[PDB]
């Protein structure tokens, strides 16, 4: 009706005003500022460890805060916790639902989480007197598949689902403390800020949104991608984040300027991006692709600084340790590989 | 030398035990048949599940038939982008696609065209010719045979298929729509469409599913062996 059309025009006016503001703050592109800096060399990471034992496609991995223990989920109904230094299997958690799509490691190391097509985020207790891993809680309430989950602390976890919503959970009570709505498509990934005061989510509507955890509101919406955003990761400084999408481009967005900074794409790359991750200093942007290899990007110059080609199937997982010593890649060939440099 | 501490050796032994258990679980899961259930909203999926047997997630049902324990996965409650999770069921033995024979006349909430049979055909086209299911056979199930027989006495098939020039009897109409469903396949060389008209009896649909799964497994074994 008339009111609906007036509201649509008003919203278009806000969109135009926001675009004009972003253009106004756009004076010099980040490529020009870093045009004088010394380019990084040829990054030549090589496989240091191969983690075998999964019998199906690995869908998610997450490093522990000690940079030694990592967890992986591989859709064979198993959650394996690895000792990356020795390739020993610390734990093997059987999942009630074998359709797991994400996994998380608590910063304290006492819990792991997983979820998938069952629309349930299951919390597992690792430090039990019985010596086995038990399901501490089964968080239900999402109407779609679970895409990502990240622990804030031992009692708070934020999940993203295919019902176009993100939720913050109180693990002890089991209820949704806050619901984050506004995405018009499936939310595929989320990344927590270093201070855990904010988090970004990338959805299938080719947009990324910044949420305030306590207030439960969307602060900024970032556009620019042409397809679904499958990956997202915060810059180590916390003032920027990078997104990986199905249009074969990785993009860097800065919160303060509220716009795109630089696009990481190549003509020879036409497959989508499954995972992104930043280096310890944020100089290197690692991204996993569907062409079975991971490309290392100079985050300040959009130059491919190296290739991590060691997987026979799609690279679905990516993770750099807290100390930045190693990077782990998960893949659909049921293998995890730990990569490191040499000097 | 070993150059390992006592605790390191014990941890290695624990990892070996975990590896053995994982191998046993994988061997157990290898001797299982995984079927993906697909269809329309009211395409007889519930009747199919009851014939071979918290949240609106994936519904997994098990049933053993002649020492061939099956796993049927129902994803009809996933109201999200199919392309974002359809690749999870890449290695399923077969896809059980259920359509209702009585939907040729019925029209869903979208009154303007969008015949339920046409909607199911469009769904069948997307799944049969999907990128992930290029070698996955489809066990097509045609449900509600009796309702189709009763509805065909008055309502002609021309409403759903104006190009149809056959008789109004049940046999020719059923064969024609089965041919329409089968011709949507664009990979006749790789995958095979098994078709069975669902009977009011209970013990015959599972027999057809078992037969089709046996044929699919034999063909897969032959392909792995290299005979064809």
């Amino acid at each position: 009706q008339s009111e609906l059309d007036q509201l649509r025009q008003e919203a278009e006016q806000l969109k135009n005003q926001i675009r004009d503001a972003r253009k106004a703050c756009a004076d010099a592109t980040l490529s020009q500022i870093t045009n004088n800096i010394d380019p990084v060399g040829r990054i030549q990471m090589r496989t240091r460890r191969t983690l075998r034992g999964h019998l199906a496609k690995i869908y998610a991995m997450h490093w522990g805060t000690d940079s030694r223990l990592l967890v992986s989920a591989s859709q064979d109904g198993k959650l394996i916790i690895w000792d990356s230094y020795t390739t020993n299997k610390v734990h093997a958690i059987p999942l009630r639902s074998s359709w797991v799509m994400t996994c998380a490691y608590a910063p304290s190391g006492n819990y792991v989480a997983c979820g998938g097509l069952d629309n349930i985020c299951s919390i597992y207790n690792l430090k039990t007197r019985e010596g086995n891993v038990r399901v501490s809680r089964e968080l239900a309430g999402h109407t779609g598949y679970l895409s990502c989950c990240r622990f804030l602390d031992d009692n708070q976890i934020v999940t993203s689902s295919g019902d176009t919503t993100c939720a913050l959970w109180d693990i002890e009570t089991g209820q949704q403390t806050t619901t984050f709505t506004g995405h018009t498509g499936d939310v595929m990934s989320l990344s927590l800020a270093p201070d855990t005061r904010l988090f970004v989510s990338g959805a299938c509507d080719a947009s990324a949104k910044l949420w305030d955890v306590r207030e439960g509101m969307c602060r900024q919406t970032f556009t620019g991608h042409e397809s679904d955003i499958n990956a997202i990761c915060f810059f180590p400084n916390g003032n920027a984040f990078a997104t990986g999408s199905d249009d074969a481009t990785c993009r860097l967005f800065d919160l303060r300027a509220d716009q795109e900074l630089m696009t990481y794409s190549h003509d020879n790359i036409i497959c989508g991006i499954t995972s992104v991750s930043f280096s310890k200093s944020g100089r290197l942007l690692l991204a996993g692709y569907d062409d079975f290899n991971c490309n290392v990007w100079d985050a300040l110059k959009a130059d491919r600084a190296g290739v991590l080609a060691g997987h026979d199937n799609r690279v679905s997982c990516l993770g750099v340790t807290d100390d930045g010593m190693a990077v782990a890649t998960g893949s659909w060939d049921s293998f995890l590989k730990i990569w490191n440099g040499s000097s | 030398g070993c150059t390992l501490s006592a605790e390191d050796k014990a941890a290695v032994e624990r990892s070996k035990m975990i590896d053995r258990n994982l191998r046993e679980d994988g061997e157990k899961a290898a001797r299982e048949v995984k079927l993906l259930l697909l269809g329309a909203g009211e395409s007889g999926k519930s009747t199919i599940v009851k014939q071979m047997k918290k949240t609106t997630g994936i519904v997994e049902t098990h049933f053993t038939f002649k020492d061939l324990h099956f796993k049927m996965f129902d994803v009809g409650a996933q109201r999200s982008e199919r392309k974002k999770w359809i690749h999870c069921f890449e290695g399923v033995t077969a896809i059980i696609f259920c359509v209702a024979l009585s939907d040729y006349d019925l029209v869903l909430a979208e009154d303007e065209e969008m015949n339920r049979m046409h909607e199911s055909m469009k769904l069948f086209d997307s799944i049969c010719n999907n990128k992930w299911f290029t070698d996955t056979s489809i066990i097509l199930f045609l449900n509600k045979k009796d309702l189709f027989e009763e509805k065909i006495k008055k309502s002609p098939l021309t409403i759903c298929y104006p190009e149809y020039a056959g008789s109004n009897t049940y046999e020719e109409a059923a064969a024609y729509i089965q041919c329409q469903f089968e011709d949507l396949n664009k990979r006749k060389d790789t995958k095979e469409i098994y078709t069975h008209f669902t009977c009011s009896t209970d013990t015959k649909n599972v027999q057809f599913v078992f037969d089709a799964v046996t044929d699919v497994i034999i063909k897969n074994n032959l392909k792995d062996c290299g005979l064809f």
Partner: single-chain antibody
Amino acid sequence: VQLVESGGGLVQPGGSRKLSCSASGFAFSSFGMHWVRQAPEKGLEWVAYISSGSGTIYYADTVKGRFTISRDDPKNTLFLQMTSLRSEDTAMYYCVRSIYYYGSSPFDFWGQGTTLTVSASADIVMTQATSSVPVTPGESVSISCRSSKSLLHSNGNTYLYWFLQRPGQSPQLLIYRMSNLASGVPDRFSGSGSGTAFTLTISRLEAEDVGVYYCMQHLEYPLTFGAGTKLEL
């Protein structure tokens, strides 16, 4: 978690006896099991060890050949078949659970123990020079320990364990790997030492902490205990 041992009592020298321990409240199959004996008015002495899954079995030199350790995982029972019993076998036998992975806490739970009575070179030497320390509540007391060879390994771990045996009670774990506090232990306990001399510090000592403190190494499987330092109130 609960371990109950049975089968003790008076035995004739040169005879045989079958000790059994019943596990309850934890996954018995996932834990390695130890038998630790304690001669009357003496210190702890490791006897035998069976790995999780019975893959690995170790015996002390004084019991090798005569003692046999076995477990029945489906029924949650640990056995110790002792034959040719000597007068030196008179001791109280404990069953100790110990799980081994990265960051685990072995020797965390000890059974109540069953008493047995017989009516008649490369082993790391763990030295506790002090035997009895008079202590007063509210003060800080440090227990000293030493080893014949360095307990620090190339992987960075120092396999030294601290145990407390309250009077009329089974020993309990305080510190594992010389620095990590066992679960349920108050924060007033602390451990240090580099590779050969180790110290356990009890800051702001109170009651219920009196007893004998034992040091154990877990570098080589002929596990050796210290003589034990007694805290007398």
